[PDB]
Amino acid sequence: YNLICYFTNWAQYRPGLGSFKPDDINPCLCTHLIYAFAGMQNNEITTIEWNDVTLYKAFNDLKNRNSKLKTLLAIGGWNFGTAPFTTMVSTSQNRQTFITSVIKFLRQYGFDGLDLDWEYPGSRGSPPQDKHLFTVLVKEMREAFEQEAIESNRPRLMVTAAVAGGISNIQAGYEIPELSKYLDFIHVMTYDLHGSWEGYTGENSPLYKYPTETGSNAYLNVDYVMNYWKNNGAPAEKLIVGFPEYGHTFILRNPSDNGIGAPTSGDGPAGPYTRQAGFWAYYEICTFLRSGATEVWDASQEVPYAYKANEWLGYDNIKSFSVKAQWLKQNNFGGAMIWAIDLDDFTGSFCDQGKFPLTSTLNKALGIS
Ligand SMILES: CC(=O)N[C@@H]1[C@@H](O)[C@H](O[C@@H]2O[C@H](CO)[C@@H](O)[C@H](O)[C@H]2NC(C)=O)[C@@H](CO)O[C@@H]1O
Ligand SMILES: CC(=O)N[C@@H]1[C@@H](O)[C@H](O[C@@H]2O[C@H](CO)[C@@H](O)[C@H](O)[C@H]2NC(C)=O)[C@@H](CO)O[C@H]1O
Ligand SMILES: [Mg+2]
Numbered sequence: 001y002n003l004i005c006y007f008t009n010w011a012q013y014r015p016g017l018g019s020f021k022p023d024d025i026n027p028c029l030c031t032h033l034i035y036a037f038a039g040m041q042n043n044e045i046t047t048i049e050w051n052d053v054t055l056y057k058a059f060n061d062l063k064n065r066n067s068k069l070k071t072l073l074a075i076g077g078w079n080f081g082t083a084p085f086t087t088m089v090s091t092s093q094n095r096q097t098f099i100t101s102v103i104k105f106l107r108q109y110g111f112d113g114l115d116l117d118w119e120y121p122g123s124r125g126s127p128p129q130d131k132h133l134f135t136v137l138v139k140e141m142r143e144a145f146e147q148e149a150i151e152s153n154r155p156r157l158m159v160t161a162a163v164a165g166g167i168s169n170i171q172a173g174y175e176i177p178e179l180s181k182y183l184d185f186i187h188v189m190t191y192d193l194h195g196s197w198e199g200y201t202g203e204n205s206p207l208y209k210y211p212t213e214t215g216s217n218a219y220l221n222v223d224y225v226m227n228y229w230k231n232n233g234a235p236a237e238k239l240i241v242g243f244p245e246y247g248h249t250f251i252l253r254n255p256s257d258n259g260i261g262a263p264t265s266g267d268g269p270a271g272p273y274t275r276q277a278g279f280w281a282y283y284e285i286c287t288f289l290r291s292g293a294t295e296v297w298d299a300s301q302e303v304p305y306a307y308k309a310n311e312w313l314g315y316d317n318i319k320s321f322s323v324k325a326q327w328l329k330q331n332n333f334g335g336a337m338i339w340a341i342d343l344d345d346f347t348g349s350f351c352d353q354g355k356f357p358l359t360s361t362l363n364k365a366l367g368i369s
């Protein structure tokens with residue numbers, strides 16, 4: 001199995017003990033580390049942070065302590081939008097400018113592949129033709145990587161993609177049978193399945209549907225999404241399950257109404273380290289739980305939730321990671337990917353569960369070490 005771990009180049013700016021850089025990564029935990037994110041300028045891949053080149057060196061130097069580790073560079077992400085991707089795939093010339101820039105960039109800085117994180121072809125303003133042009137891009141990138149390995153006499157650079165977990169976005173965005181022929185791995189973002197945007201409580205990454213859910217609400221679970229990809233053309237061995245090391249937060253309209261689906265208001269509280277409404281890192285979650293929150297196991301969906309006063313949290317813990325790891329193994333998937341290792345309790349001093357408690361759980365369950 002593969003354990004693919006995302007690292008984010010803005011974690012360095014979090015205050016105090018939240019600050020995280022590549023030297024804080026245990027090189028033995030994952031099989032692949034993915035660097036989020038590169039950007040794009042004039043259809044060429046670029047850095048985005050002033051010290052990316054330094055962090056790239058520190059990131060790929062982790063391979064000096066694990067000969068099997070591979071690293072990839074992710075381009076895009078949610079906040080990158082779609083317009084630069086649309087423009088880049090719109091002509092063969094723009095695509096070749098991009099592919100050429102990617103090859104030089106990955107080889108120069110020491111990466112083993114590219115993770116495409118366009119969120120998403122055919123949605124969020126991307127026009128309908130981008131569904132097919134994404135296939136064209138991935139095929140041309142795969143073929144260019146094949147030819148560069150021949151011409152450079154080095155192992156082929158990998159091409160992977162992080163892909164939608166929402167069915168509407170999947171249907172608008174991906175030619176799954178053809179895409180799956182050229183991608184090395186498909187990183188399915190089976191999280192953010194519920195959150196404050198809905199106006200009621202729900203789990204970030206439930207394994208199964210809640211018993212009353214029907215119709216399109218019944219799409220919002222890991223089991224359905226992964227089987228959607230599998231049964232629409234993707235080989236299971238290429239499919240990687242997404243595991244969040246964070247949770248979503250909500251404000252309950254009434255503290256007495258605190259189950260799944262309870263009405264909520266606003267964007268949800270922010271944490272002192274991640275400082276973003278609606279979102280807590282696992283180490284921020286531990287601070288909340290320790291202060292007297294009520295903990296509930298959502299038995300039907302195999303995930304925990306917690307609440308205190310009018311604050312409600314849908315999240316993952318060791319138990320839920322363990323259940324979903326055994327589920328992905330029993331369904332023959334290629335492994336797991338984590339968003340993101342800088343959100344684990346990497347110091348071990350927030351959760352009293354040891355260093356990297358969530359990532360270590362998957363390392364053990366997937367037989368990584
Ligand atoms: C693959 C992907 O799109 N992941 C998302 C993250 O990028 C989001 O994090 C937010 O990312 C922006 C881009 O640099 C940061 O400026 C912002 O501070 C960051 N927020 C946090 C809490 O790290 C993430 C949360 O929005 O959602 C996806 O994971
Ligand atoms: C299944 C599905 O499509 N869920 C959507 C959520 O993904 C989405 O939330 C946003 O997701 C991004 C990555 O998927 C995150 O970067 C972003 O922070 C998050 N927005 C939040 C937490 O407020 C919402 C859009 O808000 O819609 C769902 O449909
Ligand atoms: Mg600082």
Ligand SMILES: [Mg+2]
Pocket residue numbers: none
């Ligand atoms: Mg009432």
